Swiss-Prot record, chain A:
The nucleosome is a histone octamer containing two molecules each of H2A, H2B, H3 and H4 assembled in one H3-H4 heterotetramer and two H2A-H2B heterodimers. The octamer wraps approximately 147 bp of DNA. Belongs to the histone H2A family. It is found in: Nucleus; Chromosome. One of its GO terms (cellular component) is nucleus. The lineage of its organism: Eukaryota, Metazoa, Chordata, Craniata, Vertebrata. The modification N6-(2-hydroxyisobutyryl)lysine is found at K26, K64, K65, K85, K108. Disulfide bonds: none annotated. The chain holds residues 12 to 120 of 130 of the full protein. The modification N5-methylglutamine is found at Q94. Its main location: nucleus. It comes from the Eukaryota. This is Histone H2A type 1. Keywords: Acetylation, Chromosome, DNA-binding, Hydroxylation, Isopeptide bond, Methylation, Nucleosome core, Nucleus, Phosphoprotein, Ubl conjugation. The modification N6-glutaryllysine is found at K85, K108. Monoubiquitination of Lys-109 (H2AK119Ub) gives a specific tag for epigenetic transcriptional repression. Following DNA double-strand breaks (DSBs), it is ubiquitinated through 'Lys-63' linkage of ubiquitin moieties, leading to the recruitment of repair proteins to sites of DNA damage. H2AK119Ub and ionizing radiation-induced 'Lys-63'-linked ubiquitination are distinct events.
Curated annotation (Swiss-Prot), chain D:
The nucleosome is a histone octamer containing two molecules each of H2A, H2B, H3 and H4 assembled in one H3-H4 heterotetramer and two H2A-H2B heterodimers. The octamer wraps approximately 147 bp of DNA. The keyword Ubl conjugation applies. It comes from the Eukaryota. The modification Phosphoserine is found at S25. There is a cross-link at K9 (Glycyl lysine isopeptide (Lys-Gly) (interchain with G-Cter in UFM1)). Disulfide bonds: none annotated. The modification N6-propionyllysine is found at K9, K22, K55, K57, K69. It comes from Xenopus laevis. This is Histone H4. GO terms for molecular function: DNA binding; protein heterodimerization activity; structural constituent of chromatin. Keywords: Acetylation, Chromosome, Citrullination, DNA-binding, Hydroxylation, Isopeptide bond, Methylation, Nucleosome core, Nucleus, Phosphoprotein, Ubl conjugation. GO terms for biological process: nucleosome assembly.
From Swiss-Prot, chain E:
Belongs to the histone H2B family. This is Histone H2B 1.1. Glycans are attached at S82. The chain holds residues 32 to 126 of 126 of the full protein. The nucleosome is a histone octamer containing two molecules each of H2A, H2B, H3 and H4 assembled in one H3-H4 heterotetramer and two H2A-H2B heterodimers. The octamer wraps approximately 147 bp of DNA. There is a cross-link at K90 (Glycyl lysine isopeptide (Lys-Gly) (interchain with G-Cter in ubiquitin)).
From Swiss-Prot, chain G:
It comes from Xenopus laevis. The modification Phosphothreonine is found at T43, T70. The modification Phosphoserine is found at S20, S49. The modification Phosphotyrosine is found at Y4. This is Histone H3.2.
Length: 109, 97, 98, 80, 95, 106, 97, 82
DNA sequence: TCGGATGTATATATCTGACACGTGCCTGGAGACTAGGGAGTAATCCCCTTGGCGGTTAAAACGCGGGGGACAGCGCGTACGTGCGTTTAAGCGGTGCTAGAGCTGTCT
DNA sequence: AGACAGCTCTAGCACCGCTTAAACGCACGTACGCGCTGTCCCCCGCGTTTTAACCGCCAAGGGGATTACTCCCTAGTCTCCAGGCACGTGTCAGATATATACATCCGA
């Protein structure tokens, strides 16, 4: 038998190409699913995961914490203009909200 | 009896985390959110890919349907980067052994 | 004269505290009983997973928080600090909930 | 029953404070309960409906997630 | 094929039953055709959710009845469920 | 002798087409025989409600032909069809005649 | 000669334009605007007459709905005059910003 | 080359839309505000429509492209096809 | 007040091209039959959900003082509505062309 | 389902002439934004009270998850034929034009 190597490794991806391919076929999104669709989709999912995790890890380091928690995920998602738009209709459990106070609310003499 | 396996992207979110922040960990709650996010985005891109295939009366979802769904769903710079990453992955996947 | 913080000074601090923290602000037991009270109106003898009551609380609190933000925006727009019921109704009407 | 009144006034305040509200009129509490009651009814009714379709007697977290997913707001952190 | 599929005849027949003296403009007819197609996709879409959420591989009256109760408001749901159950009752009993 | 499933169900809507569409719309790999019958009944019911309100609006406007204005007036006036079609825009529909009491003269 | 006091013709115009469904923006200027914007995404694009009408119907409905929401928040501020901040508020509360 | 055609949407046109929307009095500032809003709205809808057109590899923007774009944005339009 | 301007709704008659009726016909609905596995049924278990007790102790409720922010009333000025004469190009009808939508067939 | 060749022939873009309503610049008034002031109420902050949320531990039972068994219901294939869908047609509904009522607003 030839040397077994995963499709993800060929694409230079960590995300499971097989699981994405199966989920597409099992979700019945279309009568047929091309071999390029799960590779492209896995790459997009992996990139978006790295994008959020990087911003979340930065927020964690900025908060002097060693683990990314729901709060760090919420701050990372809401602080980025594009992630906030992509996840505008999404609620993150235990994430809270961004520290925000309107100028008229701040104290005065 | 024995509990049935429940598949999740936990090991993939962690492996990607080790790439962006080797020293940083992730709590189970945050991992559940990342798993939820991956599955949510997957359904959205696949959902739009279905609509595109249907509108063009096509039966097969290909990279073009995914790329178009990505451009439609993801914002401008995220779309450009995602398209570049997807194109690099698919091109290298096809050219590699 | 006993030292007392001026009105709103503690509120400004409370805002930072609650915005800094992420714990749920409604008590689990009152919320859990409220969920079952409403659920009883649709189907008798219903059971709720421990996590299902939590999911309803997370969404309910995030919804009310998001609603209060939009409500505060329209209260400020009316050149007011205090949010009134018409501010909530306006925010809900403009949000497309009626 | 009284469970609608069971969501304490400080609990509403804390939500308003987290929402950035600096001052709250005494009428916001009754209004907020009504708004929450109709919100919970719409989510519970769908969750109960998803439960009934499954012929189950317990409302799972997924049933609530799907109810929210349909209600137009997605909740992350409960799986699925 | 070039064939066009539309609910023109069915909307007209229902209109004749609802108001035999009343007609419908080609513009209003195209709206109704799009409305039927839209509502059909919503119910079928929700029905697909229910089947998948319960890992069922088929769409039955239960999925439709549930999807209708989810998508349609209270009175529309009650009347639609009544019409649906009645239609299935007659369809099954009439053989 | 062949008798259409629509007549068997007592429906005007094309049960065969509804079944065809459900089978072609990839909503599931299988479609139960009761599904298109139930769906067609709901579609016919909603069609009858829409047209009934539209026809009544046309009669109130002394018109005998339903135009987009009547469909819009019907959908927005009915407190339940409005909620179902809240995200829908009807071409040439216009809006409901409505001026806020604060804008009217003293 | 005879002159209508401020607000009289406005109310009459509101009734007239609400009682009527025709397109209020000139078709040719709107068609040019669509083409101008479309050329940014892709040059030499052609627009079906039905496609331009679709954009105008949606745009007029969208703006009319936005003006309704704007009017509601203008009345809330105890003003009859709509201001840019009113449009900005409605768009932010609507979640499109 | 088409340029500065946004000013082609006359003030009376914006007035009429506002009048249909029930607006009694319109600030002179609203006209430029409305053009910017519409410019963003049309950019979003046309970007999606052109995206469907490009995916179909067509050079003519079909009416269905606008309907699908409006549908995706939660503003589906009835009257231009199913 | 209040009567006159004077736009919008309505009523009248003519018209006209829209849709409602009449037709041809073919392909998509209905009928028949099968395979087969999805779905239903039954028994079992167990776990987690519901229920209860204890208790304590954080949070909520309640009372109160007062001050600050909601809002009535006010002045004004400048912005916006409305009217007019100007003039502009959109709207309309007509003519030109050929890009490229849509389709077929291959076909691979 | 797209590469390739080719046909159609639609209809989108290109262009001119004319019409005239819509757009425009400007006149000019007072309606209406809002800055300022007054005020009072009702909302905040805290002491004080108390209660019920919370923790922790145990019961138990039922319903959810599971395995085992079955079969009846649907997809696939085939048969068939008249339902529905482009074409044909005409007639009558509400657009357009005209006349004229009335309700709504303005200058006196």
């Amino acid at each position: 038998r030839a040397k077994a190597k995963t499709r993800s490794s060929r694409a230079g991806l960590q995300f499971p190409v097989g699981r994405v391919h199966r989920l597409l076929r099992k979700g019945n999104y279309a009568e047929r699913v091309g071999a390029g669709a799960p590779v492209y989709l896995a790459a997009v999912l992996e990139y978006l995961t790295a994008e959020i995790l990087e911003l979340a890890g930065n927020a964690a380091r900025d908060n002097k914490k060693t683990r990314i928690i729901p709060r760090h995920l919420q701050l990372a998602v809401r602080n980025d203009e594009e992630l906030n738009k992509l996840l505008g209709r999404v609620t993150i459990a235990q994430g809270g909200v961004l520290p925000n106070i309107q100028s008229v609310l701040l104290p005065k003499k | 009896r024995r509990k049935s396996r429940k598949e999740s992207y936990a090991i993939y979110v962690y492996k990607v985390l080790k790439q962006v922040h080797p020293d940083t960990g992730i709590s189970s709650k945050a991992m559940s959110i990342m798993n939820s996010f991956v599955n949510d985005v997957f359904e959205r891109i696949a959902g739009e890919a279905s609509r595109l295939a249907h509108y063009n009366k096509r039966s097969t979802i290909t990279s073009r349907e995914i790329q178009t769904a990505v451009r439609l769903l993801l914002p401008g710079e995220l779309a450009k980067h995602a398209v570049s990453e997807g194109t690099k992955a698919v091109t290298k996947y096809t050219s590699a052994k | 004269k006993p030292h007392r913080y001026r009105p709103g000074t503690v509120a400004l601090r409370e805002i930072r505290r609650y915005q800094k923290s992420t714990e749920l602000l409604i008590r689990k037991l009152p919320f859990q009983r409220l969920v079952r009270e409403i659920a009883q109106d649709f189907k008798t003898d219903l059971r709720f997973q421990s996590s299902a009551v939590m999911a309803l609380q997370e969404a309910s609190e995030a919804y009310l928080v998001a609603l209060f933000e939009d409500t505060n925006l329209c209260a400020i727009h009316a050149k007011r600090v205090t949010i009134m019921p018409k501010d909530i109704q306006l925010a809900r009407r403009i949000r497309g909930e009626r | 029953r009284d469970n609608i009144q069971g969501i304490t006034k400080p609990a509403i305040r804390r939500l308003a404070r987290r929402g950035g509200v600096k001052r709250i009129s005494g009428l916001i509490y009754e209004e907020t309960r009504g708004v929450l009651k109709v919100f919970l009814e719409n989510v519970i009714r769908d969750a109960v409906t998803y439960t009934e379709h499954a012929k189950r007697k317990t409302v799972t977290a997924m049933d609530v997630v799907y109810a929210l997913k349909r209600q137009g707001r997605t909740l992350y952190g409960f799986g699925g």
